[PDB]
Each structure stands twice: as structure tokens, then as C-alpha cells.
Design a protein around this ligand. Structure first.
Ligand SMILES: [Cl-]
Length: 164
């Protein structure tokens, strides 16, 4: 298991434009295109992302290319953020994956707002951090995925992803 396999499990893979859990146009492995309700606007973003005039449809190779870029962007966002970087630096590689997962799903700004959870993670108060993380719109809206990510933070193991 690793961050790529982890996010592949959590996001799935779809080669045609679809709507994510919030109703936003998305493609591939959870690549958000736009928050606009316009499918045309989504298609425009897709073509710009891929570098060709698509039919709202991409190849697996293209989906994986975007995915790698998005994983990179998440790590980049963490390392450039004053609130996220020290917590990330403080973590083991398994828990680092959980942090990347959250940033991939909700963005750097959203994750940086988990101030109290972040503090508990940096203190390595795993059970307390887990309890705090679950007190969120995030957990309520995507509880099964959030449970997996929280279990990863709680245990520093891949146990939540091993049956998957
Ligand atoms: Cl599930």
C-alpha cells in the first residue's frame, strides 16, 4: 500500500466526466474539473488539463498522468503551508499518506482549518486526534472514507485499506 493505491481506492477511476460527492464535475481518479454547474465549463477545463480537444472522455494513461500531478500538487500544498508543513514533517510515512489524502480531497486551506486536530497529530495523541477529526463536515459527508483516513492517522498502519 502507498498514497497512490490508497487514493485509487478512495476515489475510484472513471474515464468519462462524472460528478463527485459534492456534485462537482470531475474525471479520472478524483480530478476535480470545476465547481461550475456548466458541463461546457467542465469540458473546457478537461481539454486544458489534458492538452487536447477531448469528448469528455480520457484514456487510463491520461487519468493516471493527471493523478500523479494531483498527488504532487497535494504534497506541494502541504510543504508550502505554514500550518501543514510542521505537522507533515512530524509524521511517519504512513500517516503522511493520510495527510496527503485529506489535502487531495478538500484542499490545503480546508485541511489547514483542522487546527486542533493538527495540534493533536503533532503531539502524537492519536486517539484524541481521531476523535477530533471525526467532528467535522468532512466525516459527516463522507464517513466511510473519513473512517479509513482517521484509522490510518490513529494506527499508523494500512489496516483500513488491506481488505480493499
Ligand atoms: Cl465504502
Amino acid at each position: 500500500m502507498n498514497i497512490f493505491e490508497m487514493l485509487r481506492i478512495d476515489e475510484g477511476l472513471r474515464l468519462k466526466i462524472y460528478k463527485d460527492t459534492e456534485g462537482y464535475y470531475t474525471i479520472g481518479i478524483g480530478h476535480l474539473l470545476t465547481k461550475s454547474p456548466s458541463l461546457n465549463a467542465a469540458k473546457s477545463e478537461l481539454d486544458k488539463a489534458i492538452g487536447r480537444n477531448t469528448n469528455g472522455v480520457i484514456t487510463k494513461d491520461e487519468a493516471e498522468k493527471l493523478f500523479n500531478q494531483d498527488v504532487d500538487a497535494a504534497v506541494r500544498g502541504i510543504l508550502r503551508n505554514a500550518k501543514l508543513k510542521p505537522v507533515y514533517d512530524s509524521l511517519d510515512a504512513v500517516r503522511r499518506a493520510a495527510a496527503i489524502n485529506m489535502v487531495f480531497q478538500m484542499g490545503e486551506t480546508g485541511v489547514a482549518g483542522f487546527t486542533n486536530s493538527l495540534r493533536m497529530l503533532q503531539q502524537k495523541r492519536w486517539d484524541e486526534a481521531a476523535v477530533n477529526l471525526a467532528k467535522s463536515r468532512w466525516y459527516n459527508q463522507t464517513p466511510n472514507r473519513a473512517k479509513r483516513v482517521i484509522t490510518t492517522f490513529r494506527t499508523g498502519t494500512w489496516d483500513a485499506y488491506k481488505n480493499l
